């Protein structure tokens, strides 16, 4: 069902700081290698008045390299697919939510996305477009109430060299009965490969890899 | 331009726990008295699988009784209007956001609303519809960076007794330059006065009054 | 009843904020059924304090609360044995403070044994640069949870220049014995520093608190 | 260098959780460059503890971290003068703990002066009911802010029954002298109770901690 190469099509409807916008994307990736590339176009609301980086992790954990010894919640859930829900709590009290309904037809994933951003300070690094990238990260994956949660401490690198923190809490909900994983980690590195001046066109890459801890247990 | 009686029309497009919905409403109230009634209809996604109460405060601070010694940020901004943004952090990590763009044509307010709910536990009081009402509340109003913030500790009274807590942080953003208020309070009491079985049809009322502290300064 | 219309207060606080250890002693008195009280506070170790004194003030007793008769008073009925309370204070710039208080009584005197810890205040923030003027008056939401009484309050420091710096308080109040619990209600506050010396080595502090239900009628 | 291949540890903690005062002494030793250590802890007042001991364990020194040559070691650099740390621990059911530790050195021994406060734990929650099995292994995000080092980590307690109970840690580590500051990096941990007596009056405690950059390469 999940092919070695899969295409992607998406549509995000968003509001941030009261500015409405729509973004469409198309791309492709390699689910079993945990890599993917998307081409994103702002089709309504351009140019965006806020840092593009707040959006980029909203643009599918099917694209994760899972070792054989950890259950792959994400690839098991197709063709039926899954949705996810996320809260993003920034350290200056900007709060974003997003939801994404993920389906499959043929060799293509489709995502139907909403994004809301609230309460960003006008002089803060989001509304002043002071961000450079997300740092790579490690997301903690755990089962709760029969679905999978993933929490990650994310940080934007800023112009100037400091960081701006955001706490992600995501719940990933399979539309079929899959084998559930044990507690584990997904290491990520998301990167904008290219963009025009106002980020109306963006080329976006993510590498993600699941694992257990590298440290052995002593209490055994 | 804000009349003694104003009408209201609204539209909400919402998603909670992945469930999309659309609610339309109409009503009216008395802005200088701080009271209003709305009639709300679920037009898509009926029946809602969650507690209707999580939406009700999202269905306009123009409907507030302001004494003359507190600047009224809300009434000053019309006819151009204002927009607001809110986060609602529940104690069990459900997080909702909402935005509303509020305009006026004649004797009628219009609201264009989004609502997103994330990460509600499936056996919690929201997804199990165990809520009875919001308690009345006291919102704290303070100026920040030229606009008006209001924060309020909210609580849902639950079936069975006990409360479920939610922290609201709102930013209200005037579309023209207004006189800003000093720190103050808005007391509220919101109530669903009638509903049908599945809350497809709701009649909703709010009373809100602004004030300084009732305690004198030493 | 052992809560007399006039009661005295004695307290000791051991604290640490931003790594700086300190000890504060206080003595005072108030009128419990009226909701008013006065304290004289002296820093006995770690002076001068490197942070805004206002972070400490609400930790220096809900026994000093005016309770209308239709609202159950959780607090006075806990005595003579008393009660303890535990509090988290989460500031908007990620400073987080905890405090605990054990409140006992002998004769016409309350005694408080207090701890305070402050973590992660930004070095240029209004706490460590002492930019605060006062707390604003407040409304605390009181609700039963798990057989004890919780109170949550959105607090705000007025700062030099008229902006505010927000703090969310979450307190649990726990009677040493079983007592009748209240319905949901509110406690309004106004806390004020009446006098201080330049480094806040000596502070005179006042509070007024009054419980109520909502003044708005119900439909 | 004053940091020897093997260092001893002595510590005193004064704490309060849920109204319950206690004092815990400890002694042990570790290998700072290997990132490993063992402590033996003894409750000297307030025994037996009425709460899950796990809440205390990460408060019982990042000098014990294996740092690679390409990441600056904030912690080793700050001795003999030492450092202090400040920590908030926010649990998902509104329990909030703080801790502070002052870390000094004489000869081949570290000394820690520790406070711990725990507030607002629910009485039927897993803390007060002693339902915790262990912390999961974790990945702490390390970043400089205002000339000192912060570390944030998403922690989880494994519970009886197999679910997890989340806690968000925010730490600030503050050197007592000038040191070379590191770039953004990670510290992987695995903390374990190796042995304990019936009421946890005596506990033998191990940590392994290792600093790293991300394992994933950049496409930028």
PDB file of C-alpha atoms in Angstrom, chain A:
ATOM      1  CA  UNK A   1       0.000   0.000   0.000  1.00  0.00           C
ATOM      2  CA  UNK A   2       2.785   2.533   1.003  1.00  0.00           C
ATOM      3  CA  UNK A   3       5.063   2.632  -2.055  1.00  0.00           C
ATOM      4  CA  UNK A   4       8.845   3.416  -1.980  1.00  0.00           C
ATOM      5  CA  UNK A   5       8.017   6.696  -3.727  1.00  0.00           C
ATOM      6  CA  UNK A   6       4.801   8.587  -2.937  1.00  0.00           C
ATOM      7  CA  UNK A   7       3.568  11.817  -4.192  1.00  0.00           C
ATOM      8  CA  UNK A   8       1.918  14.580  -2.078  1.00  0.00           C
ATOM      9  CA  UNK A   9      -0.785  17.169  -2.666  1.00  0.00           C
ATOM     10  CA  UNK A  10      -1.986  19.548  -0.025  1.00  0.00           C
ATOM     11  CA  UNK A  11      -4.127  22.580   0.713  1.00  0.00           C
ATOM     12  CA  UNK A  12      -3.790  24.695   3.920  1.00  0.00           C
ATOM     13  CA  UNK A  13      -6.365  27.285   4.925  1.00  0.00           C
ATOM     14  CA  UNK A  14      -4.864  29.570   7.588  1.00  0.00           C
ATOM     15  CA  UNK A  15      -5.279  32.646   9.730  1.00  0.00           C
ATOM     16  CA  UNK A  16      -2.512  34.235  11.704  1.00  0.00           C
ATOM     17  CA  UNK A  17      -2.721  37.580  13.523  1.00  0.00           C
ATOM     18  CA  UNK A  18      -6.109  37.930  11.640  1.00  0.00           C
ATOM     19  CA  UNK A  19      -4.488  37.632   8.243  1.00  0.00           C
ATOM     20  CA  UNK A  20      -6.233  34.935   6.139  1.00  0.00           C
ATOM     21  CA  UNK A  21      -4.251  32.928   3.633  1.00  0.00           C
ATOM     22  CA  UNK A  22      -4.234  29.741   1.503  1.00  0.00           C
ATOM     23  CA  UNK A  23      -1.232  27.611   0.519  1.00  0.00           C
ATOM     24  CA  UNK A  24      -1.120  24.783  -1.997  1.00  0.00           C
ATOM     25  CA  UNK A  25       1.591  22.242  -2.264  1.00  0.00           C
ATOM     26  CA  UNK A  26       2.787  19.383  -4.334  1.00  0.00           C
ATOM     27  CA  UNK A  27       5.766  17.136  -3.948  1.00  0.00           C
ATOM     28  CA  UNK A  28       7.071  13.687  -3.424  1.00  0.00           C
ATOM     29  CA  UNK A  29       9.182  11.580  -1.136  1.00  0.00           C
ATOM     30  CA  UNK A  30      10.483   8.234  -0.015  1.00  0.00           C
ATOM     31  CA  UNK A  31       8.475   7.005   3.054  1.00  0.00           C
ATOM     32  CA  UNK A  32      10.829   4.224   3.998  1.00  0.00           C
ATOM     33  CA  UNK A  33      13.849   6.513   3.904  1.00  0.00           C
ATOM     34  CA  UNK A  34      12.087   9.228   5.964  1.00  0.00           C
ATOM     35  CA  UNK A  35      12.723  11.974   3.351  1.00  0.00           C
ATOM     36  CA  UNK A  36      10.489  14.268   1.247  1.00  0.00           C
ATOM     37  CA  UNK A  37      10.420  17.511  -0.790  1.00  0.00           C
ATOM     38  CA  UNK A  38       7.505  19.866  -1.170  1.00  0.00           C
ATOM     39  CA  UNK A  39       6.879  22.834  -3.403  1.00  0.00           C
ATOM     40  CA  UNK A  40       4.583  25.325  -1.722  1.00  0.00           C
ATOM     41  CA  UNK A  41       2.736  28.311  -3.239  1.00  0.00           C
ATOM     42  CA  UNK A  42       0.811  30.997  -1.349  1.00  0.00           C
ATOM     43  CA  UNK A  43      -2.364  31.259  -3.532  1.00  0.00           C
ATOM     44  CA  UNK A  44      -4.321  33.650  -1.282  1.00  0.00           C
ATOM     45  CA  UNK A  45      -3.051  36.268   1.165  1.00  0.00           C
ATOM     46  CA  UNK A  46       0.458  36.781  -0.297  1.00  0.00           C
ATOM     47  CA  UNK A  47       2.700  38.194   0.834  1.00  0.00           C
ATOM     48  CA  UNK A  48       2.496  36.646   4.388  1.00  0.00           C
ATOM     49  CA  UNK A  49       3.156  39.220   7.076  1.00  0.00           C
ATOM     50  CA  UNK A  50       4.667  36.629   9.508  1.00  0.00           C
ATOM     51  CA  UNK A  51       7.627  34.232   9.669  1.00  0.00           C
ATOM     52  CA  UNK A  52       7.016  31.360   7.166  1.00  0.00           C
ATOM     53  CA  UNK A  53       8.791  28.935   9.513  1.00  0.00           C
ATOM     54  CA  UNK A  54       5.763  28.744  11.885  1.00  0.00           C
ATOM     55  CA  UNK A  55       3.988  26.826   9.091  1.00  0.00           C
ATOM     56  CA  UNK A  56       6.575  24.405   7.891  1.00  0.00           C
ATOM     57  CA  UNK A  57       6.097  21.482  10.299  1.00  0.00           C
ATOM     58  CA  UNK A  58       2.362  21.554   9.380  1.00  0.00           C
ATOM     59  CA  UNK A  59       3.310  20.792   5.763  1.00  0.00           C
ATOM     60  CA  UNK A  60       3.082  13.527   7.627  1.00  0.00           C
ATOM     61  CA  UNK A  61       4.887  11.022   9.734  1.00  0.00           C
ATOM     62  CA  UNK A  62       4.375   8.341   7.023  1.00  0.00           C
ATOM     63  CA  UNK A  63       7.655   9.928   5.899  1.00  0.00           C
ATOM     64  CA  UNK A  64       9.773   8.535   8.685  1.00  0.00           C
ATOM     65  CA  UNK A  65      12.414   5.802   8.622  1.00  0.00           C
ATOM     66  CA  UNK A  66      11.232   3.206  11.097  1.00  0.00           C
ATOM     67  CA  UNK A  67      13.504   0.348  12.121  1.00  0.00           C
ATOM     68  CA  UNK A  68      11.918  -3.123  12.026  1.00  0.00           C
ATOM     69  CA  UNK A  69      11.867  -3.303  15.824  1.00  0.00           C
ATOM     70  CA  UNK A  70       9.528  -0.353  16.347  1.00  0.00           C
ATOM     71  CA  UNK A  71       5.935  -0.515  15.219  1.00  0.00           C
ATOM     72  CA  UNK A  72       5.128   2.022  12.485  1.00  0.00           C
ATOM     73  CA  UNK A  73       1.868   3.534  13.474  1.00  0.00           C
ATOM     74  CA  UNK A  74       1.819   5.679  10.329  1.00  0.00           C
ATOM     75  CA  UNK A  75       2.439   3.272   7.519  1.00  0.00           C
ATOM     76  CA  UNK A  76       0.095   0.687   9.049  1.00  0.00           C
ATOM     77  CA  UNK A  77      -2.818   3.148   8.924  1.00  0.00           C
ATOM     78  CA  UNK A  78      -3.196   3.234   5.082  1.00  0.00           C
ATOM     79  CA  UNK A  79      -5.087   3.045   2.786  1.00  0.00           C
ATOM     80  CA  UNK A  80      -7.713   4.300   5.322  1.00  0.00           C
ATOM     81  CA  UNK A  81      -5.339   7.111   6.471  1.00  0.00           C
ATOM     82  CA  UNK A  82      -5.296   9.266   9.614  1.00  0.00           C
ATOM     83  CA  UNK A  83      -5.641  12.705  10.935  1.00  0.00           C
ATOM     84  CA  UNK A  84      -3.608  14.713  13.345  1.00  0.00           C
ATOM     85  CA  UNK A  85      -4.118  17.647  15.710  1.00  0.00           C
ATOM     86  CA  UNK A  86      -1.372  19.907  17.092  1.00  0.00           C
ATOM     87  CA  UNK A  87      -0.900  22.728  19.562  1.00  0.00           C
ATOM     88  CA  UNK A  88       2.080  24.951  19.297  1.00  0.00           C
ATOM     89  CA  UNK A  89       2.800  27.040  22.418  1.00  0.00           C
ATOM     90  CA  UNK A  90       5.435  29.674  21.946  1.00  0.00           C
ATOM     91  CA  UNK A  91       7.401  31.153  24.859  1.00  0.00           C
ATOM     92  CA  UNK A  92       6.008  34.714  24.388  1.00  0.00           C
ATOM     93  CA  UNK A  93       2.433  33.267  24.407  1.00  0.00           C
ATOM     94  CA  UNK A  94       1.702  33.082  20.664  1.00  0.00           C
ATOM     95  CA  UNK A  95      -0.395  29.962  20.367  1.00  0.00           C
ATOM     96  CA  UNK A  96      -0.969  28.113  17.143  1.00  0.00           C
ATOM     97  CA  UNK A  97      -3.241  25.174  16.355  1.00  0.00           C
ATOM     98  CA  UNK A  98      -3.324  23.024  13.279  1.00  0.00           C
ATOM     99  CA  UNK A  99      -5.198  19.994  11.963  1.00  0.00           C
ATOM    100  CA  UNK A 100      -4.520  17.774   9.032  1.00  0.00           C
ATOM    101  CA  UNK A 101      -6.652  15.048   7.485  1.00  0.00           C
ATOM    102  CA  UNK A 102      -4.442  12.662   5.506  1.00  0.00           C
ATOM    103  CA  UNK A 103      -5.870  10.357   2.772  1.00  0.00           C
ATOM    104  CA  UNK A 104      -4.378   8.346  -0.021  1.00  0.00           C
ATOM    105  CA  UNK A 105      -5.457   7.657  -3.710  1.00  0.00           C
ATOM    106  CA  UNK A 106      -3.059   5.699  -5.785  1.00  0.00           C
ATOM    107  CA  UNK A 107       0.528   6.571  -5.172  1.00  0.00           C
ATOM    108  CA  UNK A 108      -0.407  10.073  -3.753  1.00  0.00           C
ATOM    109  CA  UNK A 109      -1.107  11.393  -0.238  1.00  0.00           C
ATOM    110  CA  UNK A 110      -3.587  14.209   0.086  1.00  0.00           C
ATOM    111  CA  UNK A 111      -3.680  16.564   3.074  1.00  0.00           C
ATOM    112  CA  UNK A 112      -6.466  18.853   4.041  1.00  0.00           C
ATOM    113  CA  UNK A 113      -4.991  21.346   6.527  1.00  0.00           C
ATOM    114  CA  UNK A 114      -6.188  24.141   8.790  1.00  0.00           C
ATOM    115  CA  UNK A 115      -3.804  26.498  10.762  1.00  0.00           C
ATOM    116  CA  UNK A 116      -4.652  29.194  13.271  1.00  0.00           C
ATOM    117  CA  UNK A 117      -2.169  31.536  14.962  1.00  0.00           C
ATOM    118  CA  UNK A 118      -3.175  33.737  17.855  1.00  0.00           C
ATOM    119  CA  UNK A 119      -1.631  36.328  20.169  1.00  0.00           C
ATOM    120  CA  UNK A 120       1.751  36.858  18.590  1.00  0.00           C
ATOM    121  CA  UNK A 121       3.426  40.073  19.948  1.00  0.00           C
ATOM    122  CA  UNK A 122       3.713  42.680  17.204  1.00  0.00           C
ATOM    123  CA  UNK A 123       7.372  43.251  17.968  1.00  0.00           C
ATOM    124  CA  UNK A 124       8.198  39.586  18.376  1.00  0.00           C
ATOM    125  CA  UNK A 125      10.294  37.403  16.101  1.00  0.00           C
ATOM    126  CA  UNK A 126       7.280  35.920  14.207  1.00  0.00           C
ATOM    127  CA  UNK A 127       5.606  39.083  13.216  1.00  0.00           C
ATOM    128  CA  UNK A 128       8.979  40.735  12.597  1.00  0.00           C
ATOM    129  CA  UNK A 129      10.262  37.817  10.470  1.00  0.00           C
ATOM    130  CA  UNK A 130      13.372  37.350  12.524  1.00  0.00           C
ATOM    131  CA  UNK A 131      13.609  33.582  12.303  1.00  0.00           C
ATOM    132  CA  UNK A 132      16.279  31.642  10.305  1.00  0.00           C
ATOM    133  CA  UNK A 133      15.190  28.004  10.714  1.00  0.00           C
ATOM    134  CA  UNK A 134      13.985  25.318  13.113  1.00  0.00           C
ATOM    135  CA  UNK A 135      16.853  23.514  14.808  1.00  0.00           C
ATOM    136  CA  UNK A 136      16.790  19.766  14.311  1.00  0.00           C
ATOM    137  CA  UNK A 137      14.814  18.088  17.089  1.00  0.00           C
ATOM    138  CA  UNK A 138      13.830  14.918  18.867  1.00  0.00           C
ATOM    139  CA  UNK A 139      10.121  14.155  19.283  1.00  0.00           C
ATOM    140  CA  UNK A 140       8.945  11.888  22.110  1.00  0.00           C
ATOM    141  CA  UNK A 141       6.289   9.383  20.832  1.00  0.00           C
ATOM    142  CA  UNK A 142       3.934   7.607  23.354  1.00  0.00           C
ATOM    143  CA  UNK A 143       0.587   5.905  23.333  1.00  0.00           C
ATOM    144  CA  UNK A 144      -2.351   7.446  25.137  1.00  0.00           C
ATOM    145  CA  UNK A 145      -5.924   6.249  25.129  1.00  0.00           C
ATOM    146  CA  UNK A 146      -5.335   3.987  22.141  1.00  0.00           C
ATOM    147  CA  UNK A 147      -3.858   6.671  19.812  1.00  0.00           C
ATOM    148  CA  UNK A 148      -0.332   8.050  19.429  1.00  0.00           C
ATOM    149  CA  UNK A 149       0.960  11.288  20.956  1.00  0.00           C
ATOM    150  CA  UNK A 150       4.079  13.041  19.993  1.00  0.00           C
ATOM    151  CA  UNK A 151       5.631  15.944  21.965  1.00  0.00           C
ATOM    152  CA  UNK A 152       8.601  17.981  20.868  1.00  0.00           C
ATOM    153  CA  UNK A 153      10.607  20.984  22.259  1.00  0.00           C
ATOM    154  CA  UNK A 154      11.168  23.019  19.193  1.00  0.00           C
ATOM    155  CA  UNK A 155      13.416  26.071  18.768  1.00  0.00           C
ATOM    156  CA  UNK A 156      13.721  28.708  16.069  1.00  0.00           C
ATOM    157  CA  UNK A 157      17.224  30.034  15.471  1.00  0.00           C
ATOM    158  CA  UNK A 158      16.920  33.808  15.180  1.00  0.00           C
ATOM    159  CA  UNK A 159      18.902  36.504  13.248  1.00  0.00           C
ATOM    160  CA  UNK A 160      21.440  37.426  15.829  1.00  0.00           C
ATOM    161  CA  UNK A 161      22.036  33.968  17.192  1.00  0.00           C
ATOM    162  CA  UNK A 162      19.466  33.423  20.039  1.00  0.00           C
ATOM    163  CA  UNK A 163      16.669  30.967  20.032  1.00  0.00           C
ATOM    164  CA  UNK A 164      12.822  31.241  20.310  1.00  0.00           C
ATOM    165  CA  UNK A 165      11.131  28.265  21.844  1.00  0.00           C
ATOM    166  CA  UNK A 166       7.897  26.523  21.014  1.00  0.00           C
ATOM    167  CA  UNK A 167       6.335  23.398  22.621  1.00  0.00           C
ATOM    168  CA  UNK A 168       4.531  21.094  20.237  1.00  0.00           C
ATOM    169  CA  UNK A 169       1.873  18.633  21.374  1.00  0.00           C
ATOM    170  CA  UNK A 170       0.454  16.467  18.574  1.00  0.00           C
ATOM    171  CA  UNK A 171      -2.082  13.620  18.636  1.00  0.00           C
ATOM    172  CA  UNK A 172      -1.957  11.283  15.663  1.00  0.00           C
ATOM    173  CA  UNK A 173      -5.189   9.274  15.181  1.00  0.00           C
ATOM    174  CA  UNK A 174      -5.270   6.213  12.844  1.00  0.00           C
ATOM    175  CA  UNK A 175      -8.521   5.434  10.972  1.00  0.00           C
ATOM    176  CA  UNK A 176      -7.812   1.792  11.362  1.00  0.00           C
ATOM    177  CA  UNK A 177      -6.798  -0.625  14.111  1.00  0.00           C
ATOM    178  CA  UNK A 178      -3.048  -0.781  13.929  1.00  0.00           C
ATOM    179  CA  UNK A 179      -0.300  -2.408  16.165  1.00  0.00           C
ATOM    180  CA  UNK A 180       0.750   0.270  18.652  1.00  0.00           C
ATOM    181  CA  UNK A 181       4.336   1.177  19.318  1.00  0.00           C
ATOM    182  CA  UNK A 182       6.253   1.312  22.573  1.00  0.00           C
ATOM    183  CA  UNK A 183       7.752   4.598  23.783  1.00  0.00           C
ATOM    184  CA  UNK A 184      10.271   5.962  21.250  1.00  0.00           C
ATOM    185  CA  UNK A 185      11.837   8.942  19.535  1.00  0.00           C
ATOM    186  CA  UNK A 186      11.636  10.557  16.079  1.00  0.00           C
ATOM    187  CA  UNK A 187      14.651  12.708  15.275  1.00  0.00           C
ATOM    188  CA  UNK A 188      13.845  15.404  12.685  1.00  0.00           C
ATOM    189  CA  UNK A 189      15.614  18.063  10.538  1.00  0.00           C
ATOM    190  CA  UNK A 190      13.307  20.302   8.551  1.00  0.00           C
ATOM    191  CA  UNK A 191      14.876  22.815   6.121  1.00  0.00           C
ATOM    192  CA  UNK A 192      13.758  25.387   3.611  1.00  0.00           C
ATOM    193  CA  UNK A 193      15.919  24.552   0.576  1.00  0.00           C
ATOM    194  CA  UNK A 194      14.875  27.548  -1.429  1.00  0.00           C
ATOM    195  CA  UNK A 195      12.436  30.485  -1.295  1.00  0.00           C
ATOM    196  CA  UNK A 196      11.731  33.769  -3.203  1.00  0.00           C
ATOM    197  CA  UNK A 197      11.967  37.015  -1.334  1.00  0.00           C
ATOM    198  CA  UNK A 198       8.475  37.025   0.319  1.00  0.00           C
ATOM    199  CA  UNK A 199       8.251  33.158   0.673  1.00  0.00           C
ATOM    200  CA  UNK A 200       5.417  33.082  -1.842  1.00  0.00           C
ATOM    201  CA  UNK A 201       7.252  30.031  -3.304  1.00  0.00           C
ATOM    202  CA  UNK A 202       9.073  27.705  -1.011  1.00  0.00           C
ATOM    203  CA  UNK A 203      10.907  24.473  -1.445  1.00  0.00           C
ATOM    204  CA  UNK A 204      10.834  22.422   1.779  1.00  0.00           C
ATOM    205  CA  UNK A 205      12.664  19.245   2.889  1.00  0.00           C
ATOM    206  CA  UNK A 206      12.373  17.000   6.003  1.00  0.00           C
ATOM    207  CA  UNK A 207      14.434  14.093   7.179  1.00  0.00           C
ATOM    208  CA  UNK A 208      12.945  12.001  10.027  1.00  0.00           C
ATOM    209  CA  UNK A 209      14.193   8.827  11.677  1.00  0.00           C
ATOM    210  CA  UNK A 210      12.678   6.812  14.508  1.00  0.00           C
ATOM    211  CA  UNK A 211      14.680   5.103  17.205  1.00  0.00           C
ATOM    212  CA  UNK A 212      14.880   3.937  20.742  1.00  0.00           C
ATOM    213  CA  UNK A 213      17.411   5.501  23.156  1.00  0.00           C
ATOM    214  CA  UNK A 214      21.045   4.946  22.206  1.00  0.00           C
ATOM    215  CA  UNK A 215      21.967   4.451  25.880  1.00  0.00           C
ATOM    216  CA  UNK A 216      21.814   1.030  27.362  1.00  0.00           C
ATOM    217  CA  UNK A 217      19.801   0.192  30.462  1.00  0.00           C
ATOM    218  CA  UNK A 218      21.703  -0.565  33.614  1.00  0.00           C
ATOM    219  CA  UNK A 219      18.931  -1.415  36.116  1.00  0.00           C
ATOM    220  CA  UNK A 220      17.880  -4.357  33.796  1.00  0.00           C
TER     221      UNK A 220
END
